[PDB]
Amino acid sequence: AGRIASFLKNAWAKEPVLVASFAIGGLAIILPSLSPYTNYAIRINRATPYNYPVPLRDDGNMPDVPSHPQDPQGPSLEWLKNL
Amino acid sequence: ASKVKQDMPPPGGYGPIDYKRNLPRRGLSGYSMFAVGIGTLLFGYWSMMKWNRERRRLQIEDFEARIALMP
Numbered sequence: 455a456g457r458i459a460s461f462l463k464n465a466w467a468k469e470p471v472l473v474a475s476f477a478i479g480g481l482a483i484i485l486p487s488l489s490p491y492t493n494y495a496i497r498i499n500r501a502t503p504y505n506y507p508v509p510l511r512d513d514g515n516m517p518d519v520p521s522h523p524q525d526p527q528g529p530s531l532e533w534l535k536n537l
Numbered sequence: 538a539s540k541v542k543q544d545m546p547p548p549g550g551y552g553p554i555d556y557k558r559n560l561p562r563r564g565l566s567g568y569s570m571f572a573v574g575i576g577t578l579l580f581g582y583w584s585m586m587k588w589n590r591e592r593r594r595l596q597i598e599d600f601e602a603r604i605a606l607m608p
């Protein structure tokens with residue numbers, strides 16, 4: 455409690471550069487695990503169509519695959535518009 | 538016959554001459570400077586977040602234009 459307080463006071467008095475470096479590094483290490491937007495970043499990376507979407511041969515047993523891009527089936531990027 | 542004339546100090550004396558160190562304080566507190574820096578950083582972060590999200594949307598749009606034109 456007080457030992458670490460005195461150590462931090464001495465470090466702030468003598469090496470503010472190292473104190474700031476360690477604080478920034480620790481924040482960069484720990485904060486991403488608590489953020490709700492990391493999943494949004496992953497989804498944004500997943501939603502970028504780098505290559506052509508190859509169509510599937512219809513066999514009459516794919517109710518969740520669209521037959522046209524404007525059909526309601528398939529993934530939606532409405533969440534991205536409002537983000 | 539006239540009075541003796543010589544280079545002499547004026548009657549009374551001379552005005553006081555300053556010699557001591559004069560370095561005024563002339564500065565803000567550390568907390569104020571650090572707070573200004575952190576606020577500037579937060580404002581920039583929020584602005585760039587919006588701008589990069591919009592840029593990602595635009596990139597997706599032109600990628601889809603490519604996908605439409607590919608066949």
Ligand SMILES: CCCCCCCC/C=C\CCCCCCCC(=O)O[C@H](COC(=O)CCCCCCC/C=C/CCCCCCCC)COP(=O)(O)OCCN
Binds near residue numbers: 465476478480
């Ligand atoms: C968990 C974070 C890890 C990742 C982030 C860090 C990334 C980069 C930072 C690390 C770089 C390497 C730094 C290595 C430190 C060397 C220490 C040392 O030996 O230097 C001492 C001096 O430094 C010391 O005083 C020894 C250590 C003192 C403590 C330093 C910081 C320790 C942690 C402080 C902050 C903790 C976290 C921040 C919380 C803030 C509180 C809210 C010798 O000084 P000289 O230059 O040789 O003197 C010549 C003239 N006399």
